[PDB]
Design a protein around this nucleic acid. Structure first.
Length: 1183
RNA sequence: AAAAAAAAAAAAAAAAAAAAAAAAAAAAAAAAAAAAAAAAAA
RNA sequence: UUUUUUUUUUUUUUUUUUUUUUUUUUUUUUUUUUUUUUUUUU
């Protein structure tokens, strides 16, 4: 495989392509040929080696595998101990994850129904099951995808990673272990093999993605694996989590030693204006921690990797150097993984309450109940008054808003989400009997698995426990309207997300402190709530609501501090609720297991997965920091601040002024976060913003490529649906575009992800018909015969896809390689910037040689070519509806990862009246006879993400008749709208004059694709910038619809909108309320109905993922100056911007073959005839 | 006068694809009741 | 034979996967007719 006609050419031809298809067939299907392919006895085992650093400095690394992985210690059950009473694991057990040991040393010698037997059963579950995490298929097919891509890329197997695969995973003539989705277990064959290797499969996969991606060279892979195997001496993850923090904080060393390095000057609006040369030297108070990190990286690290870090300090010249060595040192200490074990194993050191620093003191309680509870309470000092001197100013404004809402509706609506539900609300919620079942309701512990960090405990949803805390959220969320402090904002996905981070990194006199606060769950004690409780109460005293069920506004007896007797004062409903909510607070997350029964936690554990909890932590943090600004302003010291953003786990703070007025204020904010009880590490620098999966230094973007996990699902549940899987893959590759230093490797790697991983598709055919479907399908397709089983109604027969399916318009939508026409002229290689959608239908025409299509003046496709490569078969498999459907509720989850989880937290309980409004809307449509599919309605949604989160293909006669129908002669069907794709571009001899920001981004690259003279940088020089305007438009669409859905006639939204329009036009208002249609959305649809009825279905449709173009322009006006259109086309056609869309999508489509020359436009005459008969705004309903 | 072939246009019955909606079939999941087997105190 | 666990047989309600049947909805298309023109023979 390392050779081929392909791997030495990289094009697709008659020979090369079909060889790739036929060969990946056996690298996928066969469970033998994979054992050869990986484990072949002809490879040179590497002893020493000489590679390069990621920047080209030549290192020399050696492959050393420890014996403890080769000959593991036997199982010594002092690793996981128990308490004497065996109520729960012993405190301070060093191992919260799997310890290495022999696979067959752990067995059950014990009778059922004991605590030991359930230990060995639960750990026996832990290594065999919880170590099974994979996306597409068997983990060995994943190693074959990565490793195959490595071979084809480097045209050899000389490289080290394969020798790790051979030394580690080949101990015998078979695979040491495999995984069966029937049992959902990793079944060991060799019982002398180590226990933790099935994770090192996924680890070798991730490292391989680092090599193909371009981050880690081969030597860097050797140091990576050496580090891993060294951390696997005792416990893999357990000994990583010590390192992962310290292994990366260095670059501030490197950035300190770089001295003067240039940088692009950002602007607030997301332009790039100048480029300045600034000193990167860290100030004194930052340079003092350098000694501590020096001493600390010695005592803890693997020696070779430590020497590689010191090497990354000494030998880094410019800033780009620090970025590269940081992507390396980040890929070495960290993997695409999901850290997981038995929840009760990691429960303590994660969610168990932690108390340190200084305690918190009570506010003096001025107003009380007859129960001696708290009504009004106010602080002596310090921290309470520090927060209240800020937060307590919003109460005046928040009273007006909380009074306006009708809070009986604020609950009813939420019950109807997740009439006759009112009578449910009352029977139930009108009695004070409700708060009994509330107070006595246990709280389930729901853990969520994180990529690079430990299991995160999340507080769960409905009902009653949230029903206690609903009101103080109804008051508490109002501050989001009144502040820039917290960020709940819309996620665009573009660089517009990061724009202001870049802005403040490029300003002068800046001190950037990004605090990692993530311990807010177990670091918030019981008294640390009162900082928020005084706020919510002091708002509720102003708030007047007559009833929030079951609370009546009524005269209640109160005791003040200065008054001995009881007094009569009118007490509202929200004031009573907020009196009990603080007056009764019990947070115990009790995980019920099979081992220990029902475990429990003490209180002061307040995990933030919800609107209540997140809006608690954000209000606390705001009050603390801004109130501290007011405190410094009250002591006369000038308060230095610019912006403060509370992200999900991270606080942003930005300063100006001298080092004393910045610094002293920074230390003051740190000291007041410590006096509130939180022990956090503030990260202070002239230039950096650390956060998570966003690293912003000097106005560049270093963003983390490891946080994306290519090979591992979080749910571990395999899904045999091919379309959905390839959507996962395409979306991840869209996430890694600007996070990967060389994202050509993503295209090969992802390609063999498509070929090797997702290929075979099992389907049962009713036994009266077997060889018939095998005939019709096996003409084009390639199947696997079976023997009809002993009297089953339907017997399984698999289907291995034609490899050409990955490139097809409705099939896999992927950045295709260049094919070969009959002219010997290859097509254009796609650069990762391409349109997934009806635009991919052009390839059928590129293979037909569109230039002759225009020279012959004909409409046609070659089924000779396309049949020879296998496009016709793939289009059978697409047209036969054989594959597995996808909703838009699944596309509601796109799976890019978000900067701030805060949005995902608040939108659980957010927008109740809206989702209820669209609910009653769509239900009214359903009552009137025209219904809507559950994908389209803005109401519902999130429900299978919420309501059904808490709960527990056959070939029939019809399919046979359809197959018989289409499979005699397929003859790929030509939709007349395809005339739009018959344009093609001549290459002129002039040159394009680049935009000014080319030179600004020419020195220190923005992201890892922006390096000088590279696809990202050059395409950026040609187009390269966002529209803040247009992005604000699509955001104005976003939070309303919940997402930005770029319109097209193929969307079921438009379809079921047109059914209504055509049939009953009086329901369009109800329909628009059901889909949450904003004003311009309504306008666009009402234009698309007229255009769609007049002209039929006519559009030129494409999809550019907002993550796919992170810095690049979505607006296709930037291609005007790039191409030229001969005046012939100006004469006849009245249309313009469509041609700018062709030129746009094409220029993004190549940028590799593009050396900077300008292009022309050649239009097929049938294209002109097709355009001049259809209005421009019909093809493009948006503009 | 004739009819037919060929070119193209207009109209017309019918299979199919897909959203929603109804009935049946199958198979699996969760609970219950009636015949029997082993049993721990009597 | 009174107190407790499982299993098999039979029965019910509900749930899900797929199949089949029926309709409205929205498009693709054998076949028939009429019309503008060329061709042929008595």
């Amino acid at each position: 495989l390392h050779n081929t006609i392909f791997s030495e050419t990289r094009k697709f031809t008659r020979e090369s392509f079909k060889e790739i298809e036929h060969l990946t067939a056996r690298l996928a299907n066969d469970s033998v040929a994979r054992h050869d392919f990986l484990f072949n006895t002809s490879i040179a085992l590497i002893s020493d080696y000489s590679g390069e650093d990621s920047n080209g400095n030549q290192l020399q690394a050696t492959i050393t595998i420890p014996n403890e992985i080769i000959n593991p210690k036997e199982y010594d059950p002092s690793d996981y101990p128990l308490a004497e009473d065996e109520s729960f694991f012993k405190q301070g057990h060093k191992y919260d994850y799997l310890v290495t040991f022999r696979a067959g040393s752990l067995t059950n010698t014990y009778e059922p129904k004991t605590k030991m037997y359930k230990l060995h059963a639960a750990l026996d579950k832990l290594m065999h099951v919880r170590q099974r995490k994979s996306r597409f298929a068997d983990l060995w097919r994943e190693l074959c995808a990565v490793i195959a891509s490595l071979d084809v890329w480097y045209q050899t197997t000389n490289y080290p990673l394969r020798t790790y695969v051979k030394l580690l995973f080949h101990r015998g003539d078979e695979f040491p272990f495999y995984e069966s989705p029937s049992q959902d277990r990793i079944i060991f064959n060799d019982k002398s093999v180590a226990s933790i290797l099935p994770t090192f499969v996924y680890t070798c996969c991730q490292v391989g993605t680092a090599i193909m991606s371009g981050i880690l060279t081969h030597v860097e892979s050797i140091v990576a694996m050496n580090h891993f195997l060294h951390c696997a001496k005792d416990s893999y993850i357990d000994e990583k989590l010590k390192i992962k923090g310290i292994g990366r904080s260095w670059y501030q060393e490197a950035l300190h030693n770089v001295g003067q390095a240039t940088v692009p000057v950002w602007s607030q609006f997301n332009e790039v204006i100048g480029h300045r040369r600034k000193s990167t030297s860290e100030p004194h108070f930052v340079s003092s921690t350098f000694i501590s990190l020096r001493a600390k990286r010695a005592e803890l690290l693997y020696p070779e990797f430590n020497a590689y870090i010191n090497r990354a300090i000494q030998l880094s010249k410019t800033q780009n150097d620090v970025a590269n060595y940081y992507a390396a040192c980040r890929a070495m200490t960290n993997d695409g993984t999901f850290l997981a074990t038995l929840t009760e194993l990691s429960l303590d050191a994660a969610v168990f309450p932690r108390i340190e620093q200084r305690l918190v003191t009570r506010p003096a309680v001025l107003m009380s109940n007859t129960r001696h509870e708290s009504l009004k309470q106010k602080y002596t000092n310090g921290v309470g008054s520090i927060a209240q001197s800020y937060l307590s100013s919003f109460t005046d404004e928040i009273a007006k808003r909380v009074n306006g809402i009708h809070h009986d509706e604020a609950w009813l609506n939420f019950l109807t989400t997740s009439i006759v539900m009112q009578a449910v609300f009352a029977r139930e919620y009108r009695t004070p009997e409700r708060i009994f079942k509330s107070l006595k309701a246990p709280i389930k512990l729901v853990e969520r698995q994180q990529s690079d960090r430990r299991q995160r405990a999340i507080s769960g949803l409905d009902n009653d426990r949230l029903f206690l805390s609903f009101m103080p959220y109804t008051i508490g969320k109002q501050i989001y309207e009144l502040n820039d402090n917290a960020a709940q904002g819309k996620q665009a996905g573009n660089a517009f997300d990061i724009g202001e981070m870049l802005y403040w990194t490029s300003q002068r006199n800046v001190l950037l402190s990004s605090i990692d606060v993530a311990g807010m769950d177990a670091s918030v004690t019981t008294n640390t709530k009162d900082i928020y409780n005084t706020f919510v109460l002091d708002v509720a005293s102003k708030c007047t609501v007559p009833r929030f069920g079951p609370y009546y506004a009524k005269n209640m007896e109160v005791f003040e501090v200065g008054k001995r007797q009881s007094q009569v004062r009118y007490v509202n409903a929200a004031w009573q609720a907020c009196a009990l909510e603080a007056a009764d607070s019990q947070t115990s997350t009790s995980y019920e297991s099979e081992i220990f029964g029902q475990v429990k936690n003490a209180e002061g554990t307040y995990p933030s997965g919800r609107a209540d909890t997140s809006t608690h932590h954000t209000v606390l943090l705001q009050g603390l920091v801004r109130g501290n600004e007011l405190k410094r302003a009250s002591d006369g010291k000038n308060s230095c601040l610019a912006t403060i953003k509370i992200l999900g786990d991270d606080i942003m703070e930005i300063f100006q002024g001298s080092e004393s007025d910045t610094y002293d204020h920074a230390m003051s904010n740190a000291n007041i976060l410590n006096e509130s009880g939180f022990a956090t590490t503030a990260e202070l620098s002239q230039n950096s913003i650390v956060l998570l999966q966003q690293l912003v230094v000097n106005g560049t973007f270093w963003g983390f490529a490891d946080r994306i996990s290519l090979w591992t699902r979080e749910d571990t549940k395999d899904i045999g649906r091919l379309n959905l899987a390839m959507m996962e893959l395409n979306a991840l590759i869209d996430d890694l575009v600007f996070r990967v230093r060389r994202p050509e490797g993503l295209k090969m790697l992802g390609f063999f992800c498509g070929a090797i991983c997702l290929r075979r598709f099992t389907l049962s055919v009713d036994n009266k018909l077997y060889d018939s479907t095998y005939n019709n399908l096996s003409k084009y397709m390639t199947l696997i015969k079976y023997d009809k089983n002993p009297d089953f109604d339907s017997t399984l027969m698999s289907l291995i896809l034609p490899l050409a399916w990955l490139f097809m318009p409705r099939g896999g939508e992927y950045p295709a390689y260049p094919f070969e026409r009959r002219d010997g002229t290859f097509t254009e290689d796609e650069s990762m910037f391409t349109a997934r959608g009806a635009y991919k239908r052009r390839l059928l025409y590129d293979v037909s040689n569109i230039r002759e299509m225009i020279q012959q003046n004909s409409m046609a496709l070659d089924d000779d070519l396309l049949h020879e490569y296998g496009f016709t078969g793939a289009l059978l498999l697409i047209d036969l509806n054989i594959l597995d459907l996808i909703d838009e509720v699944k596309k509601e989850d796109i799976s890019p990862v978000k900067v701030s989880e805060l949005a995902t937290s608040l939108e659980q309980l957010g927008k109740l009246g809206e989702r209820e409004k669209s609910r009653r809307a769509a239900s009214d449509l359903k009552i009137r006879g025209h219904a809507l599919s559950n994908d389209i309605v803005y109401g519902y949604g999130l429900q299978e993400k919420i309501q059904k989160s808490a709960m527990a293909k056959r070939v029939s006669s019809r399919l046979h008749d359809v197959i018989v129908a289409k499979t005699r002669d397929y003859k790929i069907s030509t939709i007349p709208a395809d005339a739009l794709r018959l344009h093609e571009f001549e290459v002129e001899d002039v040159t394009v004059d680049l935009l000014p920001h080319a030179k600004h981004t020419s020195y220190s690259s923005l992201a890892y694709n922006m390096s000088f003279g590279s696809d990202g940088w050059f395409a950026f020089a040609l187009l390269g910038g966002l529209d803040r305007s247009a992005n604000l438009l699509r955001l104005d669409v976003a939070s309303i619809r919940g997402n930005y859905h770029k319109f097209s006639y193929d969307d079921p939204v438009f379809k079921q909108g047109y059914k209504i329009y055509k049939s009953d036009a009086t329901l369009l208002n109800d329909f628009f309320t059901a889909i949450s249609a904003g004003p311009k959305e309504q306008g666009i649809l009402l234009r698309a109905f007229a255009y769609y009825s007049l002209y039929g279905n006519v559009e030129y449709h494409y999809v550019l993922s907002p993550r796919q173009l992170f810095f690049l322009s979505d607006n296709p006006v930037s291609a005007e100056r790039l191409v030229r259109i001969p005046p012939k086309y100006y004469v006849s056609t009245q249309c313009r911007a469509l041609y700018n869309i062709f030129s746009y999508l094409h220029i993004l489509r190549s940028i590799a073959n593009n050396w900077g020359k300008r292009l022309k436009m050649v239009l097929h005459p049938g294209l002109i005839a097709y355009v001049r008969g259809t209005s421009q705004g019909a093809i493009l309903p948006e503009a």
